[PDB]
Symmetry: D2
Subunit: 355 residues, 4 copies
């Protein structure tokens, strides 16, 4: 168990940006700018800084050239400058390695703390950031597939209850989860900003970054991304979807960048800001929990995820999940799922749905 510090938790506003190490900057730029339409906040020969349509902070995504593609930092904005001090004291009490840079790690961020958190993830906490032109009414720039906000992150970690309790202590509230009757937890979603998630835990070998998610305004914007990828003859980089999620109720798509970093496109989840927001638990065998339409979840979605770095920039060693595998219990040889609980019609045994 990760104990609760006596030091007060930092007041976390939201997920704010991710720094991804990429191997070929120009190829990554083509994907995130030319295909996906993110907006350039700064670039040079080593980094590209990108933001979504409605953002006013400096960036939502930093692409950093490096030898090994990996998550370098998942950053959360905190409410006040003093909250960076709180974060430092909190993680120090947890016994975690921390690094404070009063002038930031990346451009357009000021005083910032990076930590190797108890689950092995590189978290950053910052308040100070350079404001930029908020493009929310720049419809002269608006793409048919426009990405409008950074929505969340999703982390692969072996022991979901352990991570959950740690995030709850940090002030994240669980909105949805997936469990079975035997008591295993397979996934949880948790928030600060009053949407279904800011970060999420997916049971698996970790620490690995499952995905970063961006929002669109409407469902047709997501469709357009798929349509554009077909036109560019990169439909093989569409991993899963588009679909309606069970968990979150959002319309979604998963796609793969040039280093196989997974990006979710997402819209139209619901408000979770009330403190007694009802928590929704789905059964792992419910074939509408992930895709509400019952489309099968391809195995790669369960098994593949990005490396993460420590504060020296080396790859974090991975810890194998010992709890039951969601893949194995649903679509593996001894797995099953149902459409209607208790009905063998519309159930799937030892394979996935739809055929």
């Amino acid at each position: 168990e990760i104990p609760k510090p006596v030091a007060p938790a930092p007041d976390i506003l939201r997920c704010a940006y991710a720094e991804l190490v990429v191997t070929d900057l120009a190829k990554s730029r083509n994907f995130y700018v030319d295909v996906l339409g993110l907006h350039v906040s700064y670039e040079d020969e080593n980094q590209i800084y990108l933001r979504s349509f409605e953002e006013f902070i400096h960036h939502n995504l930093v692409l950093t050239k490096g030898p090994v593609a990996a998550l370098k930092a998942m950053a959360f904005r905190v409410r006040t400058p003093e909250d960076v001090d709180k974060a430092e004291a909190y993680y120090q009490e947890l016994g975690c390695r921390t690094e404070r840079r009063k002038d930031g790690f990346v451009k357009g961020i000021g005083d910032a703390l990076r930590v190797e958190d108890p689950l092995g993830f590189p978290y950053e906490f910052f308040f100070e950031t350079t404001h930029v032109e908020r493009l929310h009414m720049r419809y002269d720039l608006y793409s048919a597939g426009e990405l409008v906000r950074l929505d969340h992150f999703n982390q692969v970690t072996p022991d979901v209850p352990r991570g959950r309790k740690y995030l709850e202590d940090l002030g994240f509230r669980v909105t949805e989860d997936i469990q079975d009757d035997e008591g295993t937890t397979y996934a949880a979603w948790m928030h600060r900003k009053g949407t279904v998630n800011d970060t999420a835990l997916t049971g698996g070998n970790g620490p690995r970054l499952h995905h970063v998610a961006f929002s669109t305004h409407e469902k047709h914007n997501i469709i357009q991304i798929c349509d554009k990828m077909g036109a560019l003859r990169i439909s093989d980089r569409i991993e899963r979807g588009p679909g309606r999620h069970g968990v979150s109720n959002a319309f979604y798509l998963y796609i793969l960048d040039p280093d196989n970093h997974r990006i979710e496109i997402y819209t139209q989840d619901y408000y979770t800001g009330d403190p007694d927001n009802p928590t929704i638990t789905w059964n792992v065998h419910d074939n509408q929990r992930r895709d509400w339409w019952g489309n099968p979840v391809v195995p790669s979605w369960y098994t593949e995820a990005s490396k993460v770095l420590d504060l020296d920039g080396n790859v974090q060693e991975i810890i194998e999940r010992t709890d039951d595998s969601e893949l194995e219990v649903t679509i593996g040889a001894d797995g099953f799922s149902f459409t209607r609980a208790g009905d063998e019609d519309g159930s799937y045994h030892g394979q996935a749905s739809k055929g």
Copy 2:
């Protein structure tokens, strides 16, 4: 074995107009088509339900007829003039097909009508006269989040596509898109009268069988809603394939299964084909974007399962086996192949379907 072109002039066909489907439980079928899908009842009794789409003014687009064996009974096309029903009768007689003409129609809301057993074993109807009903196109008080606005097309399973294609072209259908390979095989063709990608289409397989009937929505989110509704009704297992973007036709689509496994496509936003030199588009059968533009795999049931069709006595037509190569086998079977980019091994699939 080639179907000759008649001396007799072809009838001037306007469009696909309605299908008569035999169903086994009229109440279960009513629940699907009316309560789930929202089609509008023009007339019903204890034996039949007459249904129309939101923008239709002719009596119906779908007749559900209770019967012992679920099947297609008639696929009907409307012709331009009452004289065109005469033309149709002379045309099919010269083809040596069985015909039956009724001056007062075979179903309610249709007048003088010709039914035929066509050269591919399908029950075609041709009619002009039909009872006009209230066009509900501005009845936004009734409009469903999933509203089906038009009948768009039919799709027929037949073993020899080129043979069927020539016959439909002589009848005045123009081919808009097709799927072929590098070895002389045709796997599918789409052909039209009304200036959309199709009014009917041919899918290579054992036949005659009816592959599907397609209805249009206004917008893509209407199709998404049908999927969402089916999830809420906990009948997502009746979603067969999709939603997706087609390669062929460029339409947004969904395939669902009614209670007798009759396949319904929901469809929107294909393109205009009414110019007589409309460019024909041919896809290679191994192109993994040809059916679903996003490269999502086509489930085997889509290729193997289709509805029975009846002859004019109401008996099931015998199924003739396809001997040409199978689209399923050559793309997703154990010796199958598909590509994302022609000539690129990366994003290609050997002996398996796309996406894992």
Copy 3:
């Protein structure tokens, strides 16, 4: 000027519901349930309790039969039970009339405080509420015009800065406003929940309630409401829109219920939850500030609003605005607006945009 209490402000989560007095319950039910598709939580011969598609608290709207159509209460949910005590102490320090009921004023609300606030508005603060089936995935019920959330209120008050200062002390943060070059404020929007607004102030004679706003998922859902109103041959109850707002950037529509209570339908504003969220100030003469496409603002939008009640159920006396009128300075016979600041081309003098004058 309204002083800042020493007592701490209650921690307000969001707007939560309004209680509207309506004169004919059956006609109001037809509007809100049959036309708009809101979901019934409870009803009887006296009241109808309604919620939006994604709501889990008991209701977003209470329709209460009474003799005089009016706003009876604008209710905000607070973070904890103890925040209701805080609300009570805060408004007592302000010298406002308060009434506390441990078992609520309306069904499905528990311990609740109502106040006649400094601007004359009946505010409620509550934490306790009866949870109901959250209908967010009930696509078997989902209509083509589905109202998915309660988004905000908008209040007519004569002195906007006075009201704004008071709301800021309550914890609301201003997101956008409308001003002129000579220091007059015409409107302000302010939030708790991290959207553009939870309540807003429109300059005018008050206290009156300008509107209550509900969200849709998508723009087409708003279009459908218009389409449906056309099919029902009640297009005369479409007051204004549909449009794209300047302020808020939301897609919008304003419609009128059977007692002329104004309802806004709204979608796709932006996130405001960061504490240094950039405020946006528009010039009153900017013809894209209200409708981004430049469509004229109908004069009834500026002049008409609902009565509000005091805690005895009597109508609050109206105080006249003395600051300049937005209607007069933009679309009246001495008014003007521009498309491009400083450009005579695309400017309008003594009339509204698009070729119309006031009727």
Copy 4:
């Protein structure tokens, strides 16, 4: 009355393109290409050739530099090369001036006939055209406001019945019209391709060109054009809309190019291809006939339209309408409109709907 020729009518497929004369080619290019996103088939110092997303013929719009902005030709594609001969013979029998160019009037069109038609309009008929890359799946190019098709033209002409008969003889079928109870026709819509219209007649002084219409896939695409015009601070070039039409049931928008040529953006009308398609007749006083939501029709919509040229390139003289004016009888001083037939409630006397009067 225009007689029906003995000579057979050409078989017309559809509206195909317009040639518009523009005064400043770079300005016009900025509008059609940079604002609206049309695709360039060809250009030089004198002309720009543009097509929609789904087109395979060479172009849907030709912009031709000249001294006087005007419609130079409205072009219809015919079914066969032999139909161009039929057109020549048909119009010659009608007593009309004709000009035949075996290699076309504009690039990418072959054998073509231009005519000064009986209503004074420059019509072109052609079959031969250079095919180009059909961009219908080029989602790498697809704009958020993408114009996917050319849909129709709309002509202003003083005597609608006279024009309607002539177009019916040419094979167009009337889908909808607007009349009153005193024998006046104010407008008619008529088709060949199986949509509500390929061309239409609007009562007024003429010949003038009312608009050219392009379609989008979905309603949000039209919304985006408005939004973009707001961002470019050219909302003054949005004339009317967006709305839902009564006539056609389409979602619509009217905008004005740099020479005040009016462009409609349009989506989701219905299928008219059956020969007994029911003809819908709206009453001119029905306030849902033009905008289904009851929004008022701006006076410029009724009064302003583009000049048209003769075959010499000179402007056609305008003949005044003597039949009653739709503007006058609906929104003018002695005008009337209703929301519900026979109901005074929701009716408008001597002014426009929604609280406006003529400027």
